């Protein structure tokens, strides 16, 4: 079993410690989500390959530029999370993560990762949204962004509902093991 | 860490520590707000024990079983006795505040109404300058610390088989050298986080309210300073 290392990078909301959460305990937090994620080792299974991939996350940090950065050596695999019910976290990805994550960790992997998925079909979240001339996050607008930044590819998933959650940590180790 | 606290933050939640039947006595609000506070100590005690492996387990096993320079050691495990003794002794503080609230007859209900204080305790004056200098001194020494580790396990053959060694057991599986170094300097980042959780199921008593939001802002002070303070070097 090969050490390989994730960071899951994005916006404060954009529900990055409710994703590493919901795959290390492998289901929703029925009574209590914890408000932070320290780390863990995960034992993952791909395509014929056992891999030890440890998980990371950078909440809390986003308002801290000479701290965050201690977040990424030795990075394999880099998730870039946004949140499909705010189209403003989508705008970041270009202009505030990609070009850290490039200058930081360069020829490391990135997935461009979609969170919140089930948002889509979310009357609270689509009238909210009118009110500011926006609706959620379209599939292709989410894989226009993976191709403008060069992303190794587009996922997305649901931590409340646990879709797609398995396939994006199974996709992250398969892109680490590249070299 | 020992077995009395381990047991008393084994299970996931406040919630689920407590007696069902004390649990519901109790307001929804209060074991929102009980779960938050719980988790803080939780993770406080989490983050003693990380300090203790890279101390006794770590730090002291090299200088007992290897023939390495002590300032080789220092630059593997920078202010790790003084990051020891900064938690600890918040931990104590935590954990006895937790002991006075406990129901009479009992060792697990308990209900903390008041945080705040010991927060701005903490976050304040001498205390908090003693925490932004060190924390800013090991945020400057941690890619040094990183990279030298990387260079005596990729050369010395008895320092490589000492890190197999310790790290063997299943509770050492998230806790190697750098994972100890990351899981320190991620700590600091964690305290605004929870606290406005708390803060934000802590509207009853308005001079909790009040303390916590004072801590609040104390503890994104301190993070601004330690974060201006930080200075990387290089081996
Ligand atoms: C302070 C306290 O412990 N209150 C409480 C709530 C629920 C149940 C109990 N019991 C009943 C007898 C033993 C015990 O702890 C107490």
Not at chain 1, 102 to 120: A, E, S, T, W, Y
Not at chain 2, 58 to 87: A, K
Not at chain 2, 91 to 110: K, V
Request: hydrophobic share 35%; charged share 30%; with cysteine.
């Amino acid at each position: 079993a090969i050490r390989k290392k994730l960071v899951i990078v994005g916006d404060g909301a954009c529900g990055k410690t409710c994703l590493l959460i919901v795959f290390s305990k492998d289901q929703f937090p029925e009574v209590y989500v914890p408000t932070v994620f320290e780390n863990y080792v995960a034992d993952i299974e791909v395509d014929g390959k056992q891999v030890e991939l440890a998980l990371w996350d950078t909440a809390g940090q986003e308002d801290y530029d000479r701290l965050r950065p201690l977040s990424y050596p030795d990075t394999d695999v880099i998730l870039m999370c946004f949140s499909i019910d705010s189209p403003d976290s989508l705008e970041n990805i270009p202009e505030k993560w990609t070009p850290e994550v490039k200058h930081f960790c360069p020829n490391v992997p990135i997935i461009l990762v979609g969170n919140k998925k089930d948002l889509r079909n979310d009357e609270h979240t689509r009238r909210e949204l009118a009110k500011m001339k926006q609706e959620p996050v379209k599939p292709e607008e989410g894989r226009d962004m993976a191709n403008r930044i060069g992303a190794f590819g587009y996922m997305e998933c649901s931590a409340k509902t646990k879709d797609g959650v398995r396939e994006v940590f199974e996709m992250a180790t398969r892109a680490a093991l590249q070299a | 860490s020992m077995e009395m606290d381990e047991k008393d933050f084994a299970a996931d939640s406040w919630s689920l520590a407590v007696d069902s039947s004390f649990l519901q006595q109790h307001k929804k609000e209060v074991m929102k707000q009980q779960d938050v506070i719980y988790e803080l100590i939780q993770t406080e005690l989490h983050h003693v024990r990380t300090l203790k492996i890279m101390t006794r387990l770590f730090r002291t096993g090299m200088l007992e079983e290897l023939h390495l320079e002590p300032g080789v050691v220092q630059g593997l495990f920078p202010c790790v006795d003084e990051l020891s003794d900064i938690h600890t002794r918040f931990l104590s503080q935590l954990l006895e505040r937790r002991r006075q609230a406990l129901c009479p007859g009992s060792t697990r209900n308990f209900v903390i109404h008041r945080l705040g204080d010991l927060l701005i305790s903490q976050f304040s004056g001498p205390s908090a300058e003693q925490m932004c200098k060190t924390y800013s001194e090991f945020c400057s020494r941690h890619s040094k610390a990183l990279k030298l580790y990387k260079e005596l396990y990729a050369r010395d053959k008895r320092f490589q088989q000492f890190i197999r060694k310790v790290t063997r057991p299943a509770v050492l599986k998230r806790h190697g050298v750098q994972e100890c170094i990351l899981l320190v300097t991620q700590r600091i980042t964690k305290y605004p986080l929870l606290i406005s959780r708390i803060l934000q199921h802590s509207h009853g008593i308005e001079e909790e309210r009040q303390d916590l939001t004072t801590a609040l802002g104390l503890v994104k002070e301190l993070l601004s300073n330690v974060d201006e303070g930080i200075y990387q070097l290089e081996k």
